[PDB]
Amino acid sequence: MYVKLISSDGHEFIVKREHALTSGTIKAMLSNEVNFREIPSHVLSKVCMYFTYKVRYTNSSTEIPEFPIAPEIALELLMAANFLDC
Amino acid sequence: MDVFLMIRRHKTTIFTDAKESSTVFELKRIVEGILKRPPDEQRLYKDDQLLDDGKTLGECGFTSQTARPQAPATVGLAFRADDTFEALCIEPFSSPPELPDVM
Amino acid sequence: VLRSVNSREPSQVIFCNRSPRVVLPVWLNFDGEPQPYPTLPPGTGRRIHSYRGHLWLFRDAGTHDGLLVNQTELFVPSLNVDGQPIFANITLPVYTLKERCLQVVRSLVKPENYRRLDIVRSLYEDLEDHPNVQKDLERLT
Numbered sequence: 280m281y282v283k284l285i286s287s288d289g290h291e292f293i294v295k296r297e298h299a300l301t302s303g304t305i306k307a308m309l310s311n312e313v314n315f316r317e318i319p320s321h322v323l324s325k326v327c328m329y330f331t332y333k334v335r336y337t338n339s340s341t342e343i344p345e346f347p348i349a350p351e352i353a354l355e356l357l358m359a360a361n362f363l364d365c
Numbered sequence: 366m367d368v369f370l371m372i373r374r375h376k377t378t379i380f381t382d383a384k385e386s387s388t389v390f391e392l393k394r395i396v397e398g399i400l401k402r403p404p405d406e407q408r409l410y411k412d413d414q415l416l417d418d419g420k421t422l423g424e425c426g427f428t429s430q431t432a433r434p435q436a437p438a439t440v441g442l443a444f445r446a447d448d449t450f451e452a453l454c455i456e457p458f459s460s461p462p463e464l465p466d467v468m
Numbered sequence: 469v470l471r472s473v474n475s476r477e478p479s480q481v482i483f484c485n486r487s488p489r490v491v492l493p494v495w496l497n498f499d500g501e502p503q504p505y506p507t508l509p510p511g512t513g514r515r516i517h518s519y520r521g522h523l524w525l526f527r528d529a530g531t532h533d534g535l536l537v538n539q540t541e542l543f544v545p546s547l548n549v550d551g552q553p554i555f556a557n558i559t560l561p562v563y564t565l566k567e568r569c570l571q572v573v574r575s576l577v578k579p580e581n582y583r584r585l586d587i588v589r590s591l592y593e594d595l596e597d598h599p600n601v602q603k604d605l606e607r608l609t
């Protein structure tokens with residue numbers, strides 16, 4: 280099962296529920312589809328890549344890579360990550 | 366191996382994974398389960414290259430090196446309206462602001 | 469409180485840096501004080517002569533971002549079995565997306581200028597709360 284996280288500019292992101300429910304904020308907003316009035320698509324796409332990175336490398340001695348953040352999206356990703364705790 | 370993909374059409378992006386040995390058609394099945402449209406009504410593309418149903422995602426260039434979790438590879442998606450396919454259209458994401466002087 | 473045991477019982481260790489950061493090994497001496505050791509470039513190693521019961525933790529040498537050793541926070545060299553050295557496998561944690569952004573932003577803005585970024589006040593206090601061995605040692609206690 281998948282959920283839909285819609286960014287502030289209309290892009291729809293379809294991620295698995297397990298991935299989205301790792302966020303306490305999104306679990307609350309689901310309890311389906313979730314609109315983020317404040318997160319543009321260049322930030323929500325990074326958020327979703329983080330869900331993938333988290334689920335893949337959580338509890339792994341297979342050396343984990345760095346999660347890359349472009350300097351131009353860092354301040355917005357920070358605000359979104361701060362608002363979602365994830 | 367798992368390959369990590371963003372299936373993109375218009376303003377839709379599916380984040381999912383698949384095996385390198387999984388086939389293009391099986392990915393069309395995965396899209397079908399999500400977007401509720403049959404494999405025959407879809408075309409998958411690598412960049413601009415239309416992909417063949419019988420080929421594995423590895424043969425189509427999706428590998429653990431290029432379809433990574435924190436940097437997934439994009440698969441273009443096109444739908445057939447009625448007897449005829451739309452052209453591959455992937456709307457770009459929004460543009461970040463100029464880097465502040467502070468950075 | 470959180471100190472190395474003075475066992476004087478040698479334990480051979482390999483610090484392995486399976487991270488992309490410059491790793492600062494930190495030994496906790498017998499009074500609990502962090503003692504920094506020579507740094508490890510990414511992917512490099514150092515055979516180190518430690519002792520059973522001793523306490524090591526590992527940090528990014530530049531930012532003091534916390535690293536993991538053998539998938540955990542603290543490394544205590546144990547008895548060498550069959551004479552084979554003990555492996556301290558230093559890896560990147562899965563940082564929260566929040567911590568990671570604080571890392572990237574901390575690294576672009578000189579701390580004098582944190583207050584010139586247009587973000588909520590909670591984030592200035594979060595940015596100014598640098599990762600820190602002293603702070604972490606209290607957390608672990």
Ligand SMILES: CC(=O)N1CCc2cc([N+](=O)[O-])ccc21
Pocket residue numbers: 317318319322354355356358359362588
């Ligand atoms: C309350 C608040 O300020 N929020 C909510 C989440 C969020 C995201 C961005 N962003 O650019 O991703 C900017 C601002 C905010």
